[PDB]
Design a protein around this ligand. Structure first.
Ligand code: ANP
Length: 262
């Protein structure tokens, strides 16, 4: 069906995107509640990311997994583009991380499991998300994690568009080098550390400074991180992409098994 803005009643803003906001919305005919990612064509062109936005719609609309946010369709007009997304009721893992400061091992390992499963599915299709970070992880009604925002996804292998914060990016990406699905493994390790510590392992006040840290893989554990968490995070944060484990090995790691709920 060919959609149009008149088909929806827009509600409160759910977030600030990079080219517009996301709104809670209801489809007039079915009363279906969902989200509307609104991007201004102006900016989309000024950044020449129409290829990304196309890769986002094309990749995400074809994914079908309970731990991956659903993209139902899209439409647009003289001015903007509208992505029709599955609405995540419980917000971002990011906000939850602000609220709780840091997660316990049970919550952390559970989120990692849902992620690994979701990434496994994405890697079976040779799809690399490449932008795994707290603000792209949404929570379902039952509090289940759902990877969202495929605005950077691309099929492996690949090269590289400009950047923002490097916090979750692998050395191979910040060094412009070629990369594959291993990129997401590095990010998963960054997340696991951030979940337990309250902040990313390579954080810094300077972009230049953060680049050095990621490049050198310079991170240390606070005393309260258990050895089981340190082992997993250390296997995940290897400079050489090839050393990074398979998602299966993550899903099976002892620390994950002993702590995870799913
Ligand atoms: N389906 C949704 N349900 C609830 N909130 C959402 C949904 N989609 C997006 N948001 C919120 O809107 C924000 C940005 O959405 P997002 O898809 O990440 O847009 P973006 O333009 O790709 N920016 P970025 O994630 O930094 O690349 C997220 O931080 C969420 O908090």
């Amino acid at each position: 069906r060919q959609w149009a803005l008149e088909d929806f009643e827009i509600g409160r803003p759910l977030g600030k995107g990079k080219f517009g906001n996301v709104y809670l919305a209801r489809e007039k005919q079915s009363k279906f509640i969902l989200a509307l990612k609104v991007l201004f064509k102006a900016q989309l062109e000024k950044a020449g990311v129409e290829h990304q936005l196309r890769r986002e719609v094309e990749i995400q609309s074809h994914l079908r997994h309970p731990n991956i946010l659903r993209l139902y369709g899209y439409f647009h007009d003289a001015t903007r583009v509208y992505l029709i997304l599955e609405y995540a009721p419980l917000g971002t893992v990011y906000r939850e991380l602000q609220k709780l400061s840091k997660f316990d091992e049970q919550r952390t390992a559970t989120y990692i499991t849902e992620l690994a499963n979701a990434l496994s599915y994405c890697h079976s299709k040779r799809v690399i998300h490449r932008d795994i970070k707290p603000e792209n992880l949404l929570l379902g009604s039952a509090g289940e994690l759902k990877i969202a925002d495929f605005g950077w996804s691309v099929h492996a292998p690949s090269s590289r568009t400009l950047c923002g914060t490097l916090d979750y990016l692998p050395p191979e990406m910040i060094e412009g080098r070629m990369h594959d699905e291993k990129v997401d493994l590095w990010s998963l390790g960054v997340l696991c550390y951030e979940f337990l510590v309250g902040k990313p392992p390579f954080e810094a006040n300077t972009y230049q400074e953060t680049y050095k840290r990621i490049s050198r893989v310079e991170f240390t554990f606070p005393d309260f991180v258990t050895e089981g968490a340190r082992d997993l995070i250390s296997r995940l944060l290897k400079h050489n992409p090839s050393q990074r484990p398979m998602l299966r090995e993550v899903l099976e790691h002892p620390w994950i098994t002993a702590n995870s709920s799913k």
